[PDB]
Amino acid sequence: MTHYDVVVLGAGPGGYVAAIRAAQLGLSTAIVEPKYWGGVCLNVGCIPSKALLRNAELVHIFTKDAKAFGISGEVTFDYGIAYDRSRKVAEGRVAGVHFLMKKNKITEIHGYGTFADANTLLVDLNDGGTESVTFDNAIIATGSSTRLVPGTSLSANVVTYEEQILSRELPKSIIIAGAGAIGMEFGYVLKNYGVDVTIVEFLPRALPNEDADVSKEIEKQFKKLGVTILTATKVESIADGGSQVTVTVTKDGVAQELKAEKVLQAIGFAPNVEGYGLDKAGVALTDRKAIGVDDYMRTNVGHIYAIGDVNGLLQLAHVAEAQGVVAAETIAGAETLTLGDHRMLPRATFCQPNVASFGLTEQQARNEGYDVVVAKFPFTANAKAHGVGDPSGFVKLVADAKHGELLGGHLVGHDVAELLPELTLAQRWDLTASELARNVHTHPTMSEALQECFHGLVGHMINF
Amino acid sequence: MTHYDVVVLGAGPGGYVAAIRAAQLGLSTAIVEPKYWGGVCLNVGCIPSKALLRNAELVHIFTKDAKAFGISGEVTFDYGIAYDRSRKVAEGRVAGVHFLMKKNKITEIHGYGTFADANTLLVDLNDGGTESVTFDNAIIATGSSTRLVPGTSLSANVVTYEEQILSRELPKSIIIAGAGAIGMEFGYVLKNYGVDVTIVEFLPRALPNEDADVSKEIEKQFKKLGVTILTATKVESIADGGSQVTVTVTKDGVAQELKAEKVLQAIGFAPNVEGYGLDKAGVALTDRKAIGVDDYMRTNVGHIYAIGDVNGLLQLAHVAEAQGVVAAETIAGAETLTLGDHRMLPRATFCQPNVASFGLTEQQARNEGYDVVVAKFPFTANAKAHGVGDPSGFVKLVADAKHGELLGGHLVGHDVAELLPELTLAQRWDLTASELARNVHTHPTMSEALQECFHGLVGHMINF
Ligand SMILES: Cc1cc2nc3c(=O)[nH]c(=O)nc-3n(C[C@H](O)[C@H](O)[C@H](O)COP(=O)(O)OP(=O)(O)OC[C@H]3O[C@@H](n4cnc5c(N)ncnc54)[C@H](O)[C@@H]3O)c2cc1C
Ligand SMILES: Cc1cc2nc3c(=O)[nH]c(=O)nc-3n(C[C@H](O)[C@H](O)[C@H](O)COP(=O)(O)OP(=O)(O)OC[C@H]3O[C@@H](n4cnc5c(N)ncnc54)[C@H](O)[C@@H]3O)c2cc1C
Ligand SMILES: CC(=O)Nc1cccc(NC(=O)CN(C)S(=O)(=O)c2cc(C)cc(C(F)F)c2)c1
Ligand SMILES: CC(=O)Nc1cccc(NC(=O)CN(C)S(=O)(=O)c2cc(C)cc(C(F)F)c2)c1
């Protein structure tokens, strides 16, 4: 029944960063994790997927663009080597998490935690033992799990991201349920490695959380890649027949069968809230079955916090880390700053072209009553995008007309995920388009498209 | 004869942007240019060089990283096709400038302008003949020319960037005089296309304007590429023997002869100040033979401005454009913002890894009496850099300890030229390290390294 100021449940990006921050602030800290040090993100998520996406991008270059770059010769690509590299990358970063745990003198507890009451955690140790731990504060960082299409089940040929990303061998053909970031990214990797890919989306646009202009562009790019995207299409049932999987869908009010060797379920993620005594701690769930929190990540139990995907606010790694910092700082009574409207946080999808966005879409800002101004600059007017060989896409900024404060930003193009920091910095610290347009951007860079958008928000664009 | 509110001399990025902004402000504008619409940058500079650099980077990726990416096959690369694409990119961007001039109702005058007095310009027209233009304001935007090693001359095998970048065929070997951005970029392109490359630099490090830690890292990567860099070495003579060029260099009083098929002179650029009647307009030069200007780009003649490389302040394209906007706004009496100390402006070099920086180096900040705080984050601790396959390099931020105000930032790594905007926005609008550390950066991106540097400036890094 050892005692810690802080016990962290789960060691994904939210949990292990919260534990570092608590340790930095002088708090005795323990973190409890049975399986994934670094969580989903480092083991089977962000880290390995970005390695596989880079490999896929190089296939797409040394295949579709070789002639235009003066590259000649018969090239072959081996997905197994891409897989192997992704696992070595993941393993190196996981070893990093353990290094940081030791550097900060955080106690690792290798097992699964169940609450006995608001201040007691019982742990089933990976070695078979059972141990108890008490705490002054708890940080729940237990993540989310894949949501299955209602009525369907997993099987040999019907998999979540986890089994798919851990496969060294690819199928001949796949059907991906869900056109969010995960489904689109897997579609990009598999199609470039020669898998027939169909992506099925219930809403009428791929990447339906994005601005509709962005959805339209990414649909066009994926069609050119040879991916079939079926939008406004409901998956009714999934039947694993062994040698093929049959997906029954409704589209245009008509039931139709699609067949493939494999099916990836990627329709969303549900917070992990069952099976570890949240009820014994007294912790309340929202109507959506996420752990409710306030702006300081506090649950309804004042000394128990919930960070990362388990609160369902914005299920991304940098959000989990930032929420972990807020919780640790709030526990310690240190100066913190809350995150505010989580819609303003940045996010990206790492197919090529990238999609990167923050804040409100143009349609959302109009619906919420802002006096909306929009500036859109296409990368066909950017010198760097032509030099790199990919002038597709654009930057679209949405601002409020009273002072030119930013409401959102929507980017699609080559490597645009790196371009968000200046925009979220301005939004957070109340710099307007008039201040942003005076910030000189290096030439020739993709980032010059930001500066032309600022000009268009305040007056007239120059190089457009 | 014909009269304009504003006449712009030269149509590089400085001139043609100044003319657009003057036009936007309602001033009747003409722009005089004999040869390069888009100037050096769009025709023989930034635009085609970044196209060649992308081709070279794809050679490097296959050549050194093919095996690790699972790519097999005997591949050849044809520099001729890189060359052809660089010209097509340049020609499209020049057509763009012409579209912008007509969209903004700017009069193009196709010829070479000479001042007759402080309000009259004589134009020798390309189509034969002479026209006289009078003006109320003039913007001199006449650029710079290559400085040669004293006593040397151009010949068939001794060239500037202009003849070299217009060459469709490559030599077997080359000596590059000067390890500035231009010399390093050509060295990167030519070495990747199989040329034996030696770069000779008078100062004791390559990219000597950069922070010494950045120079050390780029020298290391170039040595791994196989480029010989000779630092603290003075070129004293260049003798073109037709079949070979002999370059005599000295270091520590010892002389040595270097031989190669070709020599590229890239030791610097001198403002263009002779031969177009500056004396007749009354415009004064600095001791270094640049046109002297104040903070609003005005020469000693109050209604004559000088922008871009001809004022020698910081000979970069985005600087020329920014100075053009200031000059045009000042002429019109519009609200403007001076650029201040030009050392704070951003700059980048586009070999791989990129180098990108702004502001003071750590040593310059120490020498000027700041209370210097430094934070350095290596890309070996960045998840995106490992996924991309290039974890080399770092981000190094220099701040003042009183409030955490940024003094400079120095980046070397994969595609880091895109990461400067947040740093220069914060420096310009007085956001300190403690405001920057709260800006959430998307995961996994190279930009997360910025956020970790902010944490180190205000406290302790988390993921390092
Ligand atoms: C394929 C894929 C790609 C992704 N790519 C990105 C991307 O590029 N960028 C991005 O920002 N996000 C990405 N994500 C999302 C990202 O993985 C999650 O947002 C992130 O991992 C959430 O972190 P977390 O700490 O909240 O939870 P998790 O990383 O899910 O970690 C929670 C941990 O809690 C442990 N746990 C659960 N219950 C208990 C218990 N009772 N006791 C002890 N431990 C317990 C689990 O074992 C798990 O390791 C991706 C996700 C997937 C699936
Ligand atoms: C190989 C190379 C690569 C470069 N890469 C980059 C890069 O990546 N990023 C960057 O920011 N900078 C880069 N530069 C520098 C960039 O090219 C210059 O800073 C930029 O061109 C300066 O713009 P400017 O308008 O001052 O002058 P210029 O572009 O030199 O244009 C001046 C124009 O004035 C005209 N002119 C001269 N005298 C007269 C006259 N009397 N009458 C009429 N017209 C006249 C000339 O014909 C010319 O077209 C590079 C330069 C080179 C050589
Ligand atoms: C002093 C010293 O040697 N320290 C050291 C040693 C070994 C490893 C590490 N650090 C890592 O391994 C960093 N990783 C854990 S990470 O997956 O790259 C990652 C993950 C996340 C969520 C966010 C980032 C963000 F920072 F980019 C990076 C530090
Ligand atoms: C409404 C409409 O149809 N407009 C249109 C049509 C055709 C072309 C263009 N514009 C260009 O071609 C832009 N170029 C000239 S540029 O070389 O790319 C360039 C150069 C510099 C110095 C800086 C940038 C910076 F913006 F990135 C870009 C506009």
Residue numbers in the entry:
A (entry chain B), B (entry chain A): 1 to 464
Question: What do the authors of the reporting publication say about this deposited model?
Answer:
Lipoamide dehydrogenase (Lpd) is an oxidoreductase component of the four major metabolic complexes inside most living cells. It generates NADH during oxidative decarboxylation of pyruvate, alpha-ketoglutarate, branched chain ketoacids, and glycine contributing to the production of high energy molecules and metabolic intermediates. While the metabolic function of Lpd is ubiquitous, Lpd fulfills an additional antioxidant function in mycobacteria, including Mycobacterium tuberculosis (Mtb), a causative agent of tuberculosis (TB), and provides electrons for the detoxification of reactive oxygen and nitrogen species. Lpd in Mtb is required for virulence and persistence in mice and is a genetically validated TB target. While Lpd is an attractive therapeutic target for TB, finding small molecule chemical matter with inhibitory activity has been extremely challenging.
